[PDB]
From a paper:
Interaction of BRCA2 through ca. 30 amino acid residue motifs, [name] repeats, with [name] is a conserved feature of the double-strand DNA break repair by homologous recombination in eukaryotes. The [name] recombinase is the central mediator of mitotic homologous recombination. Oligomeric [name] binds to the resected strand, forming a pre-synaptic nucleofilament (NF), which then invades homologous dsDNA that serves as the template for repairing the lesion. Here, we have studied in detail the interactions of the two [name] repeats in [name] BRCA2 with [name].
Numbering used by the authors:
A (entry chain D): 107 to 129
B (entry chain A): 134 to 305, 333 to 353, 360 to 374
Write the structure that this text describes.
Amino acid sequence: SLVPTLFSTASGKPVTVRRESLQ
Amino acid sequence: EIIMVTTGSREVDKLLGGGIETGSITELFGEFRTGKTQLCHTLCVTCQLPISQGGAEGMALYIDTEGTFRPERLVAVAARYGLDPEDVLANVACARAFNTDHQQQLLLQASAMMAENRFALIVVDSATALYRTDYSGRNELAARQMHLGKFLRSLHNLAEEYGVAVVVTNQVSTTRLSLRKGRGEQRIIKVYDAEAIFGIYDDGVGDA
Ligand SMILES: Nc1ncnc2c1ncn2[C@@H]1O[C@H](COP(=O)(O)OP(=O)(O)O)[C@@H](O)[C@H]1O
Ligand SMILES: [Mg+2]
């Protein structure tokens, strides 16, 4: 289960992170 | 564990003993049009360069609070260093946050991204545009400097933990550098303590 972020690649690709990582 | 990311100018790197150090926070102080953002853009590509070329061989995390991040500049810099622009654009993550609500969550997200993937530089342009409003967003934020101080403290922790270089820009362990305007379109940088002249070009920061 990944979680959305406010970050995005300069190429425009949205960035996601695993919830456990945010945990 | 500490590497020096080339700034694109040999003279500046010589004054900075190789360039921007990793694992620590480097604060850029300068008025408008001093090249603070342009320097950050150049570093976002140099951090991806091979160590031999003065890079940290890592990605870049750009926190834009001034809304002045332009991916096209990164492309021009990549051309100078002979790096595929597509890769450099994919190796730079950026979050444009003007509200305090989003700005307050960036640090947490940055840590997770740095834990999942290898980053070499975290850019914050600028701390001046950070925490301008309160959490609601309706009013002015009380004691902004106290809130900003805690932000930098956590950012220094990320710097030490993930061994990433952190460049924070300010309009007008921490290494403080001052930017100024030279004779012409040249720029002068010096530590708060001995000065070096660098130029801003399409390819980005450089010498002469
Ligand atoms: N493509 C370019 N070629 C040459 N000089 C540039 C270019 N882009 C920006 N500059 C120079 O960068 C200087 C500083 O811009 P910037 O870093 O955005 O300012 P600040 O330090 O206030 O954030 C400007 O005065 C301008 O002359
Ligand atoms: Mg700026």
